[PDB]
Amino acid sequence: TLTITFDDFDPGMLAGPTSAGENLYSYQGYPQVTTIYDNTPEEYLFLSMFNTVGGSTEYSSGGIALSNWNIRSNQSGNTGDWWYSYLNQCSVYNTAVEAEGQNKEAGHSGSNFGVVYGYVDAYNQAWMAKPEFYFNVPRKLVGLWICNTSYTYGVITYGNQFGSTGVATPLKEMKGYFQVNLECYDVNGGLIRTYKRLLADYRNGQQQVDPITTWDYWEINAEGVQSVKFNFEGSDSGAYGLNTPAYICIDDITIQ
Numbered sequence: 001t002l003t004i005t006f007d008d009f010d011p012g013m014l015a016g017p018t019s020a021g022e023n024l025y026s027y028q029g030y031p032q033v034t035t036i037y038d039n040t041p042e043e044y045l046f047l048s049m050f051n052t053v054g055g056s057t058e059y060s061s062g063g064i065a066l067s068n069w070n071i072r073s074n075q076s077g078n079t080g081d082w083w084y085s086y087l088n089q090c091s092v093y094n095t096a097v098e099a100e101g102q103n104k105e106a107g108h109s110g111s112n113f114g115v116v117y118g119y120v121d122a123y124n125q126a127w128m129a130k131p132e133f134y135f136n137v138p139r140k141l142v143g144l145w146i147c148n149t150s151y152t153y154g155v156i157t158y159g160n161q162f163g164s165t166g167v168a169t170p171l172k173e174m175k176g177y178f179q180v181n182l183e184c185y186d187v188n189g190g191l192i193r194t195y196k197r198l199l200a201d202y203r204n205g206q207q208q209v210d211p212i213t214t215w216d217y218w219e220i221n222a223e224g225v226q227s228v229k230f231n232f233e234g235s236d237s238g239a240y241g242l243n244t245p246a247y248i249c250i251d252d253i254t255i256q
């Protein structure tokens, strides 16, 4: 058995100066981290790269960032919904850990963890692609730990607005659900199996699921996985698809 803990990855890969992760984008003046991995590009255990969508390579195109952030509250100077905004996208929501900011030992392992962003639905499927990672060779994927991001936790709990018209509704109110999917692929890129996990559920007397507030184990036991994709499904979905921020944090991936 091995565990990918993220804690030993190159610091140069850590998301942006602040918890907005300004270096996850081409255009904000920082060396942009498109690619994370454990050792070198030559010999790695794990590797994710940002997708390219309409010729543009960005965290929004779907991918996985390395983070050591755990802010879940308006820091000095921030107001309104800031702590569950995209300007704190990189933060894990972890209530088991009193101090908040950068390397505050808030992973299921140390300070570090992956932040998954992206999803595909009927509205964006023509252009968008799912976040993905790879093993260097096919592996038994035993399981992994997960936790919500402050952004996702917040918007589930309170909703928000975004852009001119965008509305996200609290899931308690509209009897909503939100789910993450872990899709395992084989050595030839064949789908082995898709794994589902409810992050929240308040549907009709369905077992109610409240969002986790600390790291929670996800048993998989998939054989011969070369690569993994993530998607999100949820019922908070209008004219332009899913409104709930399509993010999850990941730590301590166990393999053999």
Ligand code: CNC
Residues within 6 Å of the ligand: 025, 058, 059, 060, 061, 086, 089, 117, 124, 155, 160, 161, 162, 163, 164, 165, 166, 167, 168, 238, 240, 241, 242, 243, 244, 245, 246, 247
């Ligand atoms: C297309 C799209 C969409 N996006 Co963008 C995505 N992917 N997005 C984009 C693109 C914008 C379009 C463009 N430049 O041409 C694109 C790829 C740049 C983008 C970017 C972002 N987006 C992001 C997110 C998280 C989201 N996006 C959605 C709005 C998400 C949408 C899904 C949805 N249900 O809305 C979405 C699929 C459709 C928007 C649309 O046309 N609707 C029309 C409407 C919302 O108002 P509008 O004035 O016509 O639309 C504008 C804004 O919505 C704005 N916009 C788009 N995304 C966001 C996100 C935020 C936080 C804000 C404040 C504005 C935007 O772009 C639109 C065109 O100007 C989102 C609901 C998807 C999701 N379920 O995760 C979600 C917001 C969650 C929430 N409740 O707040 C990013 C933070 C992703 C990231 N990891 O970086 C990022 C923020 C900007 C950046 N730093 O690059």
Ligand SMILES: [Ca+2]
Residues within 6 Å of the ligand: 005, 006, 007, 107, 108, 109, 110, 111, 112, 113, 251, 252
């Ligand atoms: Ca870790």
